Amino acid sequence: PIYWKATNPTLSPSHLQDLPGFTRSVYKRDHALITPESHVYSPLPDWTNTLGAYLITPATGSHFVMYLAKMKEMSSSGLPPQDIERLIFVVEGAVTLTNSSSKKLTVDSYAYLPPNFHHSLDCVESATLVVFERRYEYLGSHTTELIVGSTDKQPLLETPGEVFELRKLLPMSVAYDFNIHTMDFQPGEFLNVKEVHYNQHGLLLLEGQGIYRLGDNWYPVQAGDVIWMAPFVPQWYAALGKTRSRYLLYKDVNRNPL
Amino acid sequence: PIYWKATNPTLSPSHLQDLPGFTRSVYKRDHALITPESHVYSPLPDWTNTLGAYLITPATGSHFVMYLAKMKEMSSSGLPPQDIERLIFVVEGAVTLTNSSSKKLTVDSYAYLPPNFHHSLDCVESATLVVFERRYEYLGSHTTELIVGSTDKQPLLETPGEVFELRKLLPMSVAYDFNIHTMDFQPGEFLNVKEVHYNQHGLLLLEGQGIYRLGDNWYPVQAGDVIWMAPFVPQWYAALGKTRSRYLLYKDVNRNPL
Amino acid sequence: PIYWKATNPTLSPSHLQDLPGFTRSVYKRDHALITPESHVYSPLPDWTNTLGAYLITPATGSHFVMYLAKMKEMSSSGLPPQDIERLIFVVEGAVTLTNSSSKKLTVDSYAYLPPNFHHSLDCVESATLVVFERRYEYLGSHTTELIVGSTDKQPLLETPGEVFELRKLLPMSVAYDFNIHTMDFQPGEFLNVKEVHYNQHGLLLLEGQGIYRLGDNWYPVQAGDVIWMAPFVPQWYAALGKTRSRYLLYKDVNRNPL
Amino acid sequence: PIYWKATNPTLSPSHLQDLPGFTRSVYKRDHALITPESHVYSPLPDWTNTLGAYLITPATGSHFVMYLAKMKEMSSSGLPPQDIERLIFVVEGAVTLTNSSSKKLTVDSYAYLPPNFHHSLDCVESATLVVFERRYEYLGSHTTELIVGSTDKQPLLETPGEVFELRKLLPMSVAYDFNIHTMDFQPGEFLNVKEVHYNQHGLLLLEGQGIYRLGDNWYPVQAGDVIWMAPFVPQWYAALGKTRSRYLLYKDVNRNPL
Amino acid sequence: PIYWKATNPTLSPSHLQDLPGFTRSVYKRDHALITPESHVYSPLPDWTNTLGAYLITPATGSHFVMYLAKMKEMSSSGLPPQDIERLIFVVEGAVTLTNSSSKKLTVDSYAYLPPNFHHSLDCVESATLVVFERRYEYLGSHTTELIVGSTDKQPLLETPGEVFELRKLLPMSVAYDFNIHTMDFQPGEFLNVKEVHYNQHGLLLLEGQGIYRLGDNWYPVQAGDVIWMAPFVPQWYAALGKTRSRYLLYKDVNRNPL
Amino acid sequence: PIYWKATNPTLSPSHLQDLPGFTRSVYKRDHALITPESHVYSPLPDWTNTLGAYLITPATGSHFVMYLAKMKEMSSSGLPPQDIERLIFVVEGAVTLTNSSSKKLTVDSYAYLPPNFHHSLDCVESATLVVFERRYEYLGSHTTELIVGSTDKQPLLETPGEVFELRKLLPMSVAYDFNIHTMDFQPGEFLNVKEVHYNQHGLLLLEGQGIYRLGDNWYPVQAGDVIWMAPFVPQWYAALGKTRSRYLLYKDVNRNPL
Amino acid sequence: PIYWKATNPTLSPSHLQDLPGFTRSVYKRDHALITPESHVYSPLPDWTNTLGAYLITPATGSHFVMYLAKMKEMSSSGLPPQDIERLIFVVEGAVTLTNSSSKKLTVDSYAYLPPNFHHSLDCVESATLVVFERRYEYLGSHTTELIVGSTDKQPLLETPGEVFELRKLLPMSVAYDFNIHTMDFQPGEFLNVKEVHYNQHGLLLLEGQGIYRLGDNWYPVQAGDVIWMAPFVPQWYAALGKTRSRYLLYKDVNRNPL
């Protein structure tokens, strides 16, 4: 299945049961490498029969949350707080979306919901969702709207001076205050620019493995690893191995950095 | 006696009189190990014949306060600020609580007082109080209520994939924005998950000894030690020795982290 | 041309194509060294056919933003939000100011813009500007007005206790919350006071090279480099090579550090 | 099977096939943590069909070698240089030792061959051997001699001030310049003395897991891991889990340190 | 030309002429990264019209030297001291080797001279040689002999557990106490085994670029770079970019490590 | 009792019985701080009924050995290997020495023994001696001779630029390659010279407490502590408390540093 | 007064008289910066009324010594051991050299003495000498001769790709296994090559001031400072201020580094 290793990591939590205290996770001043055996699942408030693990919250200094959601048999989502926009990405399984016709989202499907937009995600079997939420930044008479889609149905964008394959999930229109990029590196390929920008990131490695650099820290990574990149931290990546690398990325945009 | 070493640490301050500047205490970006020889006791404003030593305050980035109150003869407590909730746990001594009847609190006894709830703690001989205070986060029309009890009465809670015995002092209801856990470990037992969560902690080791890991730091701990765990700091623990480990722990709950 | 080595640094990005992930940039808690291989250019909103890269933003804990704007053939600028004073400085090219008259702004020609002071920049061929923005701290009734000039036209001010050549593009009258200094160093010359002050800095080395100190970190620098100095961060410089050193410097002034 | 995890580690090399460059191994000035995914097996000189991995050699600053020997079907050992004493301990399999009769060795069986003592190890199927060799420090006329045994047959020794169960495979008389110990720790138990001695070590954890402290470094460990301890390195261990800990240890003795 | 970048590194020393003191070179306790801007060339004693730069000498704790020799018009080699075996490798130009016979050596050509083997390297126009010298370690009554060849004529050896392409320039027989390896990696390929071995290394990256891990340090590397690996330093490499990586590697062999 | 705190230190091993893995001991590149909880006692070879604890040996790079010998009932010294010179100092108890009119030495007594000078130390009750030993560096004809004495019956020497009070147990004459110093410091006094010399030290604090500086490390110290100072390590000491600091110091002298 | 500050540093020990333990001295693994407050002066053996302080000895990993001899009222210089070569530099004062005729060495005068060569220095008043002593390495049948002279009498030398003015005090002739250079930099100039080589230095900053880079370390240096440079340490210098930088330097040459 697609994204299988993102749910079944080559180095899983159980392979460490005889290494007391060991972990690959790190939380530093400007970034964080959050790995599978550190995930903290607990009932998701307001949700019905769902465990979740918060990987990133503004406690870190971000303006967004990023959490994993384990939905099981007959379990439903619950409305997010007032003025909070939400974005979900099916990483495994299938869930149904409803408010104009019930759309069924399987793997690789995603859905954006404008702040205060009444909806419900219901599941009847399994489903592992990767969700992003943020207190929307109203700007002028500008507003967002319901977006539903599939990665593959998104066109390959131009990447001046880069070789990775880029696909954006939400519209690039000024309304949206963040977008979800899908980036792919073939084995050996890497980022030419050593980005240093006020933007901030939260990412999930869906396929492959490689080396990710943050500040003066170099980290080996595998499918399933999660990373938080705080504004202005030097970032870089290289894809390694026989298979390609794909990571889901959150990026804030269309707003004055003041 | 119950919690005797918590009040009489094996390695005491006087023991260090011949080691200028020496301390086991460490205050870092996302945590802190606060030890006895560093406690700063000063009279608690609005209290009677009660010496207090604050160990954690929002100055650290937390949203709660943690302090020890050494109540001597004919001592009494003072009401907390407006909208501030309070919780006291008796480590040593006896103290009566009034408001609906009148409860006598001894070692292992505790009491949660809702925000703006009138009450008074009065000590005849002496009492040692470990208390947490916080600005209550009102969630709709929910409100808390007086809670009284003692650890030895709270049922053992099972936690999946873990081996430590757990007890929760307060109700798990949505109205409470924090709970106090009691965690026990037999010598040799440890946390299977190396937690990284949005939740923040404040902890006190009542009995036992062991190794506490915070981020990339490892600290030997003995009863009486206090720890501050900021959000997302990697945390782990292992119980060592002949006797068991037991620690009181604050944990924020039921509120959207966004 | 003057400042040419800023637009074209000796050690330029392409010279690093065969050093995967290699970078001279550093982002620490109290300072930052942003180099050319890390600039992230994205289309500046409200501007016309122009790429821009933010180098400093409040996310760093500053009260100001500093960015590079690469104006191309037939381009114009956008107005900043409300109460955002703006200063621009031409490091290369030419661009006409407009709105009260119309100045042909070229290399070394800067233009201040009071808050909400409507104005516009337009370029027919090509221009590169280093612009600073920040929410003006309204002091009493005092207010600002348009200012336009050139680096070589400003006076050489005395520098008590120091040897570098000092200039200030903007007035010192308390109406201005920030000032932009010009500093010249002859090979072998260095700052005499290991400054430690509340003021914050953002700087671009316009000409030359030398060693820059920040806290306990020492960085070799060349023209085109950019530095971020947070308050209270120990700073120090020394110019080297056969040619003098010159850097554009932002500095906050005339406002209670309270 | 005895010591099954020592040869089939819970966190094995394969589990790390998707984490490029990752390793739990460390080599520092005064110690080393050598783990499986780092063993370098090469044909052993003078041996027949036997791959070997040197874990420790005098390049480290030690006076002994410690290597692993994978003896496959129909194999035999080779004689060691002149004046080199040898000790072999069987971790997996079986091998016959001939030369005073021939003995069939098995897991837990060990043989010590004095310097220049003709012998031959002949394996028919498989056998894993941990061996130590050293340029014997002759002392006067005393001379060591053939010693063939089995851990279990060895008696437990009194270790004043410690709770671990100790055994020594070789005699304690002056001729021997080193001894091999078998140290057992029950969960929760740990060393009381934070050892700092001139004696150097080489160890292999056969069963269990725990934390090993070396200087200011703390390492989680599991059966299979190997430690190099240089003279005078602060050392400490703690056993953890459900199962007990057992490590093989080399120790130089009976020779004036000056 | 073959190995061009190796002769003219992408990031050449001149490119850094405006960065006083800057360098990619590192010299640590158990390894080193020697780069072009650090090459110290000097008249090589006993040679004629040849500049030499020693990169590694036993002062590092190695048992061999490694240097680049810049032979100019009408130049000739100098004999190595008694018992000093020598191996040369041509990375640029051409030189002749006389005295048994005479071979014309171009790029990729090499010659191993046994200890005390009289010879001579005469170059007409110019050539660049990376040469290795070591005091030969006599074992019993074995002796090495002249070996001359070409990397390409050498056969691809089996690399069990790895995917890279391996070639060995000298015989693997007992007489040789070291061999020089040629290792090729296609982009995205890396070492599966994170080596920790007593063998020490001398390395020159002839083609490609990538990331090298030495202990807990990561280094971006390019053609022309040189690395020193002391015994037991954890090592790892991953090739990145469009073209493959190739590196010359010295390795000590066939001698007992005690 | 004299030097009582040296034998029974304020902070003692048993005070840390609940602090798993904790120690004040440090073993670095240029120095060491060996504290009581790290002392490793084992039967001293040839000695009778005595347990020794080597604190310093050549393995550290020193040219001497320093150890504490604890002699019990009917105990006696043993002879040091050939050509070795021995110095003893009784810190607790009583020992008699013979071989010419025997002698009895009590706390604060001592005796130097020329290389190969036959002698015997006979104790009844018990005594704890701190002893040094080295391979005497013969300076041609020069020879050493037996010595007996007591710190207090030894003259106070000059100490220009230094406020402390000194005493040298051995004669400064050329035939002696080392002496033992006694340095007293009064609360608040400290070494004015921030030493960096070829000499090497072994220092046991007998009285007082304070702060010793070694390189960039600052170590709080208490009577009983022991320090290893390698050549050229920046050293320093300041005394604190109500009492005075007093330590026994080894210093190599009278030999060419070549 | 030529070389005044070298004898009376701008930052003096007495200035640090109220900074307990402070020192600018650094002694690391591969290098060292020794400053004025750390010099340990003690009576030089075999000398007459001369206080000497050893700055660098083979204990550092050097093959030479470098000390300062303070010659007072009627003082003589003791003879070096057998086979030890010796060079002397008069930093200040006056001393007379006699074996073949008398020689009056004054500030800037130097004399090199071959091994086993007989000579004597005699001082009436004061004289500060910086001397280097080394066991001579006999190559073939070459022998060195006695050399005497002054810096400015020495010719300027070609400094390819460099700008500092060079001068050598000894013959580059093969017989000599070391030389002493005089290097001058103007304020602002610096080394282009960030040197990494087998040669080992021992320098004295005679005039000027600037920044010295050793490894990843940056040290502000002043006249009077001393530096030990072990083989292969990355090194670099920059002169600064109004006067010029001038430093004396040791460097081993003409010997195979095997």
Ligand SMILES: [Mn+2]
């Ligand atoms: Mn980015």
Ligand SMILES: [Mn+2]
């Ligand atoms: Mn927790």
Ligand SMILES: [Mn+2]
């Ligand atoms: Mn400033």
Ligand SMILES: [Mn+2]
């Ligand atoms: Mn031990």
Ligand SMILES: [Mn+2]
């Ligand atoms: Mn290797």
Ligand SMILES: [Mn+2]
């Ligand atoms: Mn000293």
Ligand SMILES: [Mn+2]
């Ligand atoms: Mn040099």
